[PDB]
Write a protein that binds this ligand. Sequence first.
Ligand code: HEM
Ligand code: HEM
Lengths: 449, 453
Amino acid sequence: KEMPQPKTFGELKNLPLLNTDKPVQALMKIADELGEIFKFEAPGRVTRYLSSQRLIKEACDESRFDKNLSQALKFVRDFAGDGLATSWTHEKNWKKAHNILLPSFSQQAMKGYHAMMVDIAVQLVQKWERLNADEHIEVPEDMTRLTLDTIGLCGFNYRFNSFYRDQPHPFITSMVRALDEAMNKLQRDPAYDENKRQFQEDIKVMNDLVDKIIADRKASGEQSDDLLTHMLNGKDPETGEPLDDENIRYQIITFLIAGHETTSGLLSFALYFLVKNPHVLQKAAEEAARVLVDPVPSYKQVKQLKYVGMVLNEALRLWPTAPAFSLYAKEDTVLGGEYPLEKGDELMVLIPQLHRDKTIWGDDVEEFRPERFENPSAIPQHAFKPFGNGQRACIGQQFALHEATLVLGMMLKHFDFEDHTNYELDIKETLTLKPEGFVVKAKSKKIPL
Amino acid sequence: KEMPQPKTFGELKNLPLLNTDKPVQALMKIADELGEIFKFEAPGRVTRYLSSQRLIKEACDESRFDKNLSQALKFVRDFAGDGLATSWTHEKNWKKAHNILLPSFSQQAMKGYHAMMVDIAVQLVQKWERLNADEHIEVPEDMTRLTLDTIGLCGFNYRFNSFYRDQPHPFITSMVRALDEAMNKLQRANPDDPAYDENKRQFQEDIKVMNDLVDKIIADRKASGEQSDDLLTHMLNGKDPETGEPLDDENIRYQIITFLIAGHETTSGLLSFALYFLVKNPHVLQKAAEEAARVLVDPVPSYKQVKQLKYVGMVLNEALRLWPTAPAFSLYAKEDTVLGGEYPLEKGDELMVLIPQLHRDKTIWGDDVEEFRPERFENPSAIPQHAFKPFGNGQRACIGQQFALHEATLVLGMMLKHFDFEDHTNYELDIKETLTLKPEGFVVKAKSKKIPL
Ligand code: HEM
Ligand code: HEM
């Protein structure tokens, strides 16, 4: 009945607890101490962090709870606009873009994106093939190069050419700097005036380039296999309307934001867990060699990388790279028979804690065992939520998993990996999670492309 | 361009291929060999069987194709009349009954039918609670008892009382024998033979039995002025907004017979296939049983609680994917058209949509099409357009879909709440075929969880 709450700071309540550089991991430690639910109070804000499958399965009841914009999402909305990720379910542009974009994110739609994904994946393989001896790989850096270029090419036929660069494309510099400002706002004022002005400059950089590419595509009339063509030609079946040019811009910015570093973190965490578990790596490398019998992987071959898919799912279990989402109660309701909630009350789903619920996974929750996902019906309802819930779930799930399965499979086919530094896991936190400083050496198997 | 075709029998062309007791399953095997489309020729009949989402999505374009009466539907029309299921789209009584009946089949209308559905569902639960040890359940038999009584009660406030009987109500005996004669006619190479003269006389006798009882109940209700929460009251009081007309007494009779035909064994087969798949996949059963116990917290389920049985709904949809109990429907080309960029069709040319094959299209569902995984339906947004058609297409889709799904969700949830199930014979799936599909001889044991009603 009475809900636990972590330590307070007078008038600031729990807010100073977020003024730390690893807030998700700090919230996980609080969940370890306080349990499946604790109240988090701040000036003008009350929310509740859920950590158990028992309560989260009720929170995922769409008749009782809808997606809420967290403070992070509200700050991201300042440059993601009413794109899919930062719009409310009741906003006209959400259901519109949802209906329009759903067919182009289907498993069937990945057949059309596969050739472009392979283009970038080959560039990653060739970079590592061309490294000199005793040089090493900066894993999250290269994974981010790959995912950024993949979404640029599949999103609107634009080549960031990240593998030709030390300093990222100017759009990426502004996007990354905007996301950093969004998170820093969470942890904060006269001194922040230059940050605020800088925020507007980065917003202008993103809008200008995306608007230009849309105008360029409209001026050309060319049809590509990218999401931009689908949005310029698609019509919402419900209202009969197409997305306007401003919303198309926000959707493109959204795909870059929501997709690039979540997916690059997944690949980085997956490789980290593989090199720390050599038996799992060997099993995944065995499948990659048996399945990828051609110089270039096909769409059908990527679907055959079953164990690689389980590896990615287990990496998402331990460290989901979009580590939380927010919900609000549509009406007065009681959560788990003992926590009354009023209409509008907010919830936070702490995904990494959910995925460590020993009542679901057993005692070995910290062990990396892809075999947990061998049979998907053995997993209880709402126990595994790395991509959100319901109609507000990740629209790019199939995109992210297809790219990550293709790239990891190619990595495992072409290289053996060495954890040459005995890397100590250090998780840097932005709005997403990544293993900072993770490095490996790759010895080529000398298999041609 | 050139269309495949199965083996022929001289002058009879492909027709003898249907003279088998599992024709849908035989047509699926032909689809496995020949692909997404094959021509089927008979004396005086040519049709084409579609199996791929690629072609079926075009056949479902209502601007190009309209519902055709299959030969099965034409034979059912001899006792279903111009009811909704056996009338052409251009017949005045279709759009009339469609406009009148659509509001009474909506999800909002299920709130009014819920109490009557619970009545029969409790009778089923009570029957199984009262079984002795090591006695067993005949699953399709009991599911048919439930669906027949539910549509009887919700349709026109009549109790067949099937759970008080070994031999069904005389109306049910005549209806089943009429449906059996309809299917047997499909498989007769010499239908005008003198031997089937007793079949023809019996067929007319069964037609008379059905009309007499339904006409009597309509007259009985009109003479009393009683108002119930059934479809018969809605049809006696409803007026088509378009023409301003109500349904006449003859059409109301045909609609009532239609609800019984189109609804009873399609729905009972779904429940039977669902329970079969649950006992063969214990992980799915546990997941569905957990939801039933958590959601159905009252002795009697409410309408709102049934809507919360999401995973039970996923189980039913996956059961409908593998074995849709109304396994085909027919279409005709409104004008000359080209199907799939290679199959030129002329005005009036007929198509058959082989639904179980559509639901096994690996280009849509992946390689694991034969596996029972309700998780495919966890997010309904993952299913492409026209890939999943257990209830038909467009304005000629199943009007009773919400009814069927509410009934099935309620009953399966109550079954999972009150009993553990054992596949005590390791039942080997054997699908008996009439105009619908059912797992013949499927039996289970139920051990009660001792939860009162
Ligand atoms: C491993 C990689 C990814 C993970 C873990 C992930 C995670 C998530 C999560 C948890 C949500 C729900 C957020 C909420 O409820 O507030 C979400 C939504 C979303 N994601 Fe992803 N995502 C990934 C990749 C991608 C990619 C590649 C794209 C685009 C190509 C994308 C686009 C979106 C969009 C548009 C939404 C909002 C959908 C809607 O609300 O209608 N994500 N994602
Ligand atoms: C799981 C159960 C059911 C399934 C799979 C099913 C399937 C179908 C299919 C495939 C059609 C289209 C037939 C065609 O196009 O020729 C149809 C039509 C129809 N069904 Fe159902 N049905 C079910 C339950 C019911 C129930 C419970 C009722 C009545 C209460 C019902 C009444 C009708 C009617 C009236 C039509 C014709 C609608 C029209 O054409 O206007 N069905 N059904």
